Amino acid sequence: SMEQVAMELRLTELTRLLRSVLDQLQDKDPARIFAQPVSLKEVPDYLDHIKHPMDFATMRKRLEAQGYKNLHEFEEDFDLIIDNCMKYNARDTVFYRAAVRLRDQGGVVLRQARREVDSIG
Ligand code: NA
Structure with missing residues (x-):
């Protein structure tokens, strides 16, 4: 259907805006402390402490799989x-x-990304 295509064009444009936002957030981490997942060889007990690890590379893979349905889901991972x-x-x-x-x-x-997403639907 033609409806499924236009949703796919929206998701694709959401993905492209989120990509720009991701690059901007990651620039505020010049030390690259949050670039990659915490190593389980170097912090073997990490998962006893933290139940839902997150990092910028793992957010990137999800993004390119167009697995963010909206900005809220993206923000949850950033948080x-x-x-x-x-x-x-x-x-x-x-x-x-x-x-x-x-x-x-x-x-x-x-x-500003909250405004651009409300603005551009
Ligand atoms: Na603490």
């Missing part, structure tokens, strides 16, 4: 990156501090 870090790492650490900075700087980017 996981931050919230996982701020639980696992103590306050006086480079890791916790980097999440705080990514959170604050990302909110500007997520604030």
